[PDB]
Amino acid sequence: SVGLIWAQSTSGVIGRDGGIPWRLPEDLAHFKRLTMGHTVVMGRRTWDSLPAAHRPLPGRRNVVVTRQTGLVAHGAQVVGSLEQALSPAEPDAATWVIGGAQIYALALPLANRCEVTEVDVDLPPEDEDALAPVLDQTWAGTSGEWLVSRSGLRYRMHSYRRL
Ligand SMILES: NC(=O)c1ccc[n+]([C@@H]2O[C@H](COP(=O)([O-])OP(=O)(O)OC[C@H]3O[C@@H](n4cnc5c(N)ncnc54)[C@H](OP(=O)(O)O)[C@@H]3O)[C@@H](O)[C@H]2O)c1
Ligand SMILES: Nc1nc(N)c(OCCCOc2ccccc2CCC(=O)O)c(C2CCCCC2)n1
Ligand code: NA
Structure with a gap:
């Protein structure tokens, strides 16, 4: 799924x-916990955004979506469409689309679960900011309590599944 x-x-x-544009260590930990051992699908700009020690994301099968046919991405598998990313030669019980905004919009109709922090x-949006998808009435969710990060930000985790 x-x-x-x-x-x-x-x-x-x-x-x-x-x-x-924020620092939330508890979300990095949440992201690792949900994705470790599984496939992570990302757009090429997200692949290029990854910090050095996280490119590729260790312990995960990294799949990068690009239109650049000749692209080499050391440590990742390069595919040419989201459909290709979701059609692996070797199945995974759990495939996560990990961004960015362009790829989320393509993946939402194919997904059955969203895990949102x-x-x-x-942060009033700036013109070049990448924005989250908005989940419509075909989705329903549950919200964790508001927590405070050790680094100061209030945050909470939501879990949505397709109705
Ligand atoms: N959870 C988070 O807070 C989170 C998660 C991930 C990313 N981010 C942030 O989001 C930003 C990046 O997101 P983004 O929306 O700019 O980029 P993106 O979705 O990561 O990547 C866009 C790229 O994907 C490829 N692509 C898009 N549509 C395609 C299609 N139909 N077929 C083939 N390839 C396709 C193209 O690669 P080519 O140009 O190579 O052809 C395109 O430039 C960064 O700021 C990053 O830090 C945040
Ligand atoms: N909830 C949720 N979903 C996502 N798709 C997501 O972006 C995952 C793609 C970006 O990865 C980053 C970014 C910067 C630094 C480290 C990592 C990966 C760490 C790892 O795993 O080795 C995130 C990140 C937000 C910023 C802090 C790290 C997690 N958080
Ligand atoms: Na690895």
Whole structure:
């Protein structure tokens, strides 16, 4: 089955300036816990956004979606479409689409689960910000309690499944 996983500010921002515009260690831990041992599918800009020690994401099968036919991505599998990414030669019990905004929009109709971290950080969207998908009435969810990060931000985790 196919899930999306993302972290967003309350305003809906997921990315800015080729990175993530807040620091939330508990979300990094949540992301690793859900994805370790499994397949992670990402757009090429997200692959390029990964910090050095996380490119590729260790312990996960990294799959990068690009239109660049000749692209080499050391440590990842390069495919030419989201459908290809979700049609592996070797099946995985759990495939996670891990961003970014362009790929989330393509994957949402193919997914049955979304794992969302909401971050209470004031970020009025800027024009080039990458934004989260919005889940419509075909999705229903459950919300964890609001927690405080050791680094100061309030955050909570939501779990949605297709109705
Ligand atoms: N949870 C989070 O907070 C989270 C998670 C992930 C990323 N981010 C952030 O999000 C931003 C990146 O997101 P983004 O939306 O700009 O980019 P993205 O979705 O990661 O990557 C876009 C790229 O995917 C490829 N692509 C898109 N549609 C395609 C299609 N139909 N077929 C083949 N390839 C296709 C293209 O690669 P080519 O140009 O190579 O052809 C395109 O440039 C960064 O700021 C990153 O830090 C945040
Ligand atoms: N909930 C949720 N969903 C996502 N798709 C997601 O982006 C995952 C793609 C970006 O990876 C980053 C970014 C920067 C630093 C480290 C990593 C990976 C760490 C690892 O796993 O080796 C995230 C990240 C948000 C920023 C902090 C790390 C996790 N969080
Ligand atoms: Na690895």
